[PDB]
Amino acid sequence: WTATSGSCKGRCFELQEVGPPDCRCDNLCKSYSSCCHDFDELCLKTARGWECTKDRCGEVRNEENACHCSEDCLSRGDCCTNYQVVCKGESHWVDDDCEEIKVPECPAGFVRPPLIIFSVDGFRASYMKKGSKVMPNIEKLRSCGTHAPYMRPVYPTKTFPNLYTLATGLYPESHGIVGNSMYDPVFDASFHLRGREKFNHRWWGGQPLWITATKQGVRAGTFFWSVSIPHERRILTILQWLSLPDNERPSVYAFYSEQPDFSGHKYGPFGPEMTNPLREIDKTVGQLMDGLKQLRLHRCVNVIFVGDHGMEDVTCDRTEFLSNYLTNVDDITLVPGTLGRIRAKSINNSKYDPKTIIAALTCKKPDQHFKPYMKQHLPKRLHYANNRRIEDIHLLVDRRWHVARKPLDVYKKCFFQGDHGFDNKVNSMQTVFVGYGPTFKYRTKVPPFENIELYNVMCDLLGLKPAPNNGTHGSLNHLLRTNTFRPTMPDEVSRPNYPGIMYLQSEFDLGCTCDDKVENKLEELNKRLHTKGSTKERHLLYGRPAVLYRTSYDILYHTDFESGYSEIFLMPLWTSYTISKQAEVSSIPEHLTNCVRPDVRVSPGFSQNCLAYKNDKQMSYGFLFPPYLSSSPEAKYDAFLVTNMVPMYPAFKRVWAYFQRVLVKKYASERNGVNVISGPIFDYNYDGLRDTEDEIKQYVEGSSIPVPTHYYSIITSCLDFTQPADKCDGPLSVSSFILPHRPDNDESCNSSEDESKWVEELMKMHTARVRDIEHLTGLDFYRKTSRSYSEILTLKTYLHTYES
Numbered sequence: 001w002t003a004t005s006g007s008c009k010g011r012c013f014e015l016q017e018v019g020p021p022d023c024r025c026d027n028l029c030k031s032y033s034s035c036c037h038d039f040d041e042l043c044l045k046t047a048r049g050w051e052c053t054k055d056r057c058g059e060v061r062n063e064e065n066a067c068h069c070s071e072d073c074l075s076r077g078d079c080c081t082n083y084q085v086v087c088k089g090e091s092h093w094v095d096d097d098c099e100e101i102k103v104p105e106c107p108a109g110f111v112r113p114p115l116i117i118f119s120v121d122g123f124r125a126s127y128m129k130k131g132s133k134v135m136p137n138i139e140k141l142r143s144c145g146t147h148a149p150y151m152r153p154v155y156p157t158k159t160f161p162n163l164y165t166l167a168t169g170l171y172p173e174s175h176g177i178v179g180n181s182m183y184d185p186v187f188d189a190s191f192h193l194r195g196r197e198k199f200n201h202r203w204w205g206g207q208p209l210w211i212t213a214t215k216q217g218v219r220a221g222t223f224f225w226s227v228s229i230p231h232e233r234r235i236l237t238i239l240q241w242l243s244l245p246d247n248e249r250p251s252v253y254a255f256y257s258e259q260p261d262f263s264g265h266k267y268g269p270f271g272p273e274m275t276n277p278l279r280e281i282d283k284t285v286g287q288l289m290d291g292l293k294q295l296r297l298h299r300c301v302n303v304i305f306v307g308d309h310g311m312e313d314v315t316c317d318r319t320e321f322l323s324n325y326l327t328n329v330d331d332i333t334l335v336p337g338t339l340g341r342i343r344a345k346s347i348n349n350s351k352y353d354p355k356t357i358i359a360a361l362t363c364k365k366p367d368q369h370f371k372p373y374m375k376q377h378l379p380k381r382l383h384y385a386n387n388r389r390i391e392d393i394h395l396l397v398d399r400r401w402h403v404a405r406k407p408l409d410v411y412k413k414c415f416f417q418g419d420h421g422f423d424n425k426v427n428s429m430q431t432v433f434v435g436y437g438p439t440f441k442y443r444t445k446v447p448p449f450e451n452i453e454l455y456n457v458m459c460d461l462l463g464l465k466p467a468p469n470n471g472t473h474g475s476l477n478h479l480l481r482t483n484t485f486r487p488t489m490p491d492e493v494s495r496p497n498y499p500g501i502m503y504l505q506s507e508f509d510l511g512c513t514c515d516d517k518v519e520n521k522l523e524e525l526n527k528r529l530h531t532k533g534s535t536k537e538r539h540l541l542y543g544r545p546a547v548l549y550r551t552s553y554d555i556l557y558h559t560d561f562e563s564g565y566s567e568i569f570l571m572p573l574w575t576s577y578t579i580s581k582q583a584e585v586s587s588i589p590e591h592l593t594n595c596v597r598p599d600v601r602v603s604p605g606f607s608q609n610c611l612a613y614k615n616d617k618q619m620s621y622g623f624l625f626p627p628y629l630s631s632s633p634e635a636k637y638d639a640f641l642v643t644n645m646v647p648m649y650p651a652f653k654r655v656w657a658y659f660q661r662v663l664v665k666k667y668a669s670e671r672n673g674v675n676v677i678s679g680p681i682f683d684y685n686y687d688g689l690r691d692t693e694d695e696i697k698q699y700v701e702g703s704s705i706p707v708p709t710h711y712y713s714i715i716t717s718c719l720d721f722t723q724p725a726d727k728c729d730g731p732l733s734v735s736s737f738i739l740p741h742r743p744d745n746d747e748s749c750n751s752s753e754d755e756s757k758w759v760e761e762l763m764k765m766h767t768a769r770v771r772d773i774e775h776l777t778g779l780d781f782y783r784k785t786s787r788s789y790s791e792i793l794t795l796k797t798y799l800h801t802y803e804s
């Protein structure tokens, strides 16, 4: 109950939120229906408009005016944003020459450059180039400051998950806002887009920037604005706040614009109706900069222009219906649209079965515009699984399409021409980033990056220590002139053993056989050097990965590859090798097809065995270093060591064999040699983090050989491809993947065809950042390069997307 008897006299846009039963006067009280009776009268004045005209100059202060042009307004902090221009011969900020801000030029009393975040809903990355003619202010920001060609949002590319990711540095799975419309089975509660349950704090996880600031003594403006507060009034309120006394004045502010998302939904991303919303946003930006200039803050404040997601062309006629697939359509609940989430309509239904649902939605029509997934099988790069609010069954919808339950859901809810929410690697979903101010660089273009990295940088800009988040702190230091945070490499926790020859062949009882008893100090002293690591500078280019957890493992050297073999998991954690541009692919000789050889450096008790794979009818095996790429017939025998073997489903062996036989060489050819690090990943609780040994849910039948959930590879070469990978003097180039280890290829609809038609498409879908692999393996890569650590962090957050 709000007894709204109180008044907003002198409290307009107050910064402390007073609760019931006192009435509120803050920028969100409208959305709660709790404002004082006089809020509109006093706080939302509109009289005379938003601009000064020549005839208002020096006027008598009329307090009913929306903003003022009276002589005392600068002292009151409440002039119209164009006051100095109209009434004092000043120029607009946009007409001024771009001039480098080498140091902050702040008014007395300003302890640190304030941060203003100007966030725009649905601002597609291509708008920067395509709308450039109608956005002079935004274009000046972009070209004078620091900018990326685009910024990558999180999945789902919806508004709330993305805005709250911006504020927290967390994936939606971790911050808890995993979509628009959510059901929490523990709360037994529903979060609705329109309603008052969404105002319950229990939904919102992590620690948003405004809370981080407050807890560390930095004051914050209030980030959220009621829709009915017009943008001009939002800007004036921010400017008024900036004129508060030093002890009362916030250091961080946010403005939000519902455009261009609002119009883009109606008219499509490039409808001709879209030009005016872009002009208007630019005008708003112009007013802010004019206002900052009036306050002498335009060479003091750091301004971030940032979007939440883009916008794609989507229409009613591009809808798939679950009723054209399922018979039991009424037994399911569907969260519909640009993504699909499915659960049982009733929990008292023991006949509900997700396996038959997924099967009915799998590869059923030739042009099917969505793909069903159990959430744990989603590409790991989406990080969209580890939350009770994310339904087991997910549909990844093709760009430009919708999924709905039944046709009646659409025509009785064309209404729209644009939408968003698709896979965050989709070009149309990319959004913008510009930073302008003393702390950002001057006229600098930076590579595209993910929006999860921004929280750390905003904390840096404000002198704050970030809450634990999913950014990689330091990976954006190249955006900044100063304030850089100087990260150090994590300490290695486990050091390796370096085993020599300790076991005789006959001590092993692995059920393995090999036709290798085929038989001189020339090339026998030579193979001793190879087992001690003489070729190691060729195959281990960036140092050994560091093991960041407590474990027991052996470094094993070979002519063609090097591995860190885990005595705990009975397989390498990583296998490293270099394939030059001139390397030749060979075949596995007829007699060596089923060859597996004991490794005399590693005890029988810490080895796999062939018997387990013989008895396990579902499970076969593969090799991490590919026998096809051996440098010599004799070297090839190394590739058949039991310590290079890993468990693989026959269906996955199809994928893995093609990668090793065909793609690695193709990459070596294209990139002038590659270094490859491959290995297993265990993530049985789909939390994106390495499993401990007691968390493994499946072993090769009858054994302690754990079955990986995924297999990764990291493929590095020289950015300057005129230098071979193994002799690179400068920056590196990387692409990686995390392939799901599945017993079937149901994910690939063309899998009955030749691997050359479907394997590489699958791999690109499961593209990954090195950083994703670090989380999943507890390893730290690139420990020894000639590059700066910050540059390595950037490399580690890179994602090769394969968009055009």
Ligand SMILES: *[C@@H]1O[C@H](CO)[C@@H](O[C@@H]2O[C@H](CO)[C@@H](O[C@@H]3O[C@H](CO[C@H]4O[C@H](CO[C@H]5O[C@H](CO)[C@@H](O)[C@H](O)[C@@H]5O)[C@@H](O)[C@H](O[C@H]5O[C@H](CO)[C@@H](O)[C@H](O)[C@@H]5O[C@H]5O[C@H](CO)[C@@H](O)[C@H](O)[C@@H]5O)[C@@H]4O)[C@@H](O)[C@H](O[C@H]4O[C@H](CO)[C@@H](O)[C@H](O)[C@@H]4O[C@H]4O[C@H](CO)[C@@H](O)[C@H](O)[C@@H]4O)[C@@H]3O)[C@H](O)[C@H]2NC(C)=O)[C@H](O)[C@H]1NC(C)=O
Pocket (backbone or CB within 6 Å): 170, 171, 173, 174, 175, 176, 202, 203, 204, 205, 206, 383, 386, 387, 388, 467, 468, 469, 470, 687, 688, 689, 775
């Ligand atoms: C992306 O980055 C994020 C952020 O770093 C990573 O997520 C973090 O990962 C950590 C490791 O998994 C995890 O540590 C947990 O913490 C458990 C309790 O955590 C609660 O408190 C969190 C902090 O809030 C406070 O933060 C500051 C200080 O930093 C304080 O000053 C403030 O006052 C804050 O209150 C809080 O954020 C977290 O909230 C979650 O749950 C809320 C609802 O309950 C949501 O609103 C919120 O959004 C969070 O929801 C996410 O996270 C939970 C996991 O907590 C997850 O289930 C959801 O799906 C969702 O994803 C909590 O309220 C702590 O109990 C854990 O300790 C267990 O494990 C250790 C392992 O050694 C054991 O020693 C220990 O015994 C214990 O085990 C016990 O429980 C077992 C299982 O129940 C049981 O079997 C066993 O027998 C024991 O009883 C552990 O340390 C963080 O919680 C998590 N943080 C966040 C914000 O999500 C994430 O990993 C990154 N992603 C990637 C891919 O890298």
Ligand SMILES: O=C(OCc1cc(Cl)cc(OC(F)(F)F)c1)N1C[C@@H]2CN(C(=O)c3ccc4[nH]nnc4c3)C[C@@H]2C1
Pocket (backbone or CB within 6 Å): 031, 117, 119, 163, 164, 166, 167, 198, 199, 209, 223, 224, 225, 226, 227, 254, 255, 256, 306
């Ligand atoms: O002004 C807003 O957004 C500024 C912003 C918000 C973040 Cl989180 C990060 C940002 O970007 C960043 F971080 F980069 F600065 C910028 N919003 C205004 C709109 C109307 N609206 C609500 O009224 C609302 C909905 C749920 C709530 N739960 N609790 N209060 C709530 C209010 C939601 C919309 C978004």
Ligand SMILES: [Ca+2]
Pocket (backbone or CB within 6 Å): 682, 683, 684, 685, 686, 687, 688, 689, 690, 691
């Ligand atoms: Ca895990």
Ligand code: NA
Pocket (backbone or CB within 6 Å): 745, 746, 747, 748, 749, 750, 751, 752
């Ligand atoms: Na298939």
Ligand SMILES: [Zn+2]
Pocket (backbone or CB within 6 Å): 122, 159, 261, 262, 265, 420
């Ligand atoms: Zn939208």
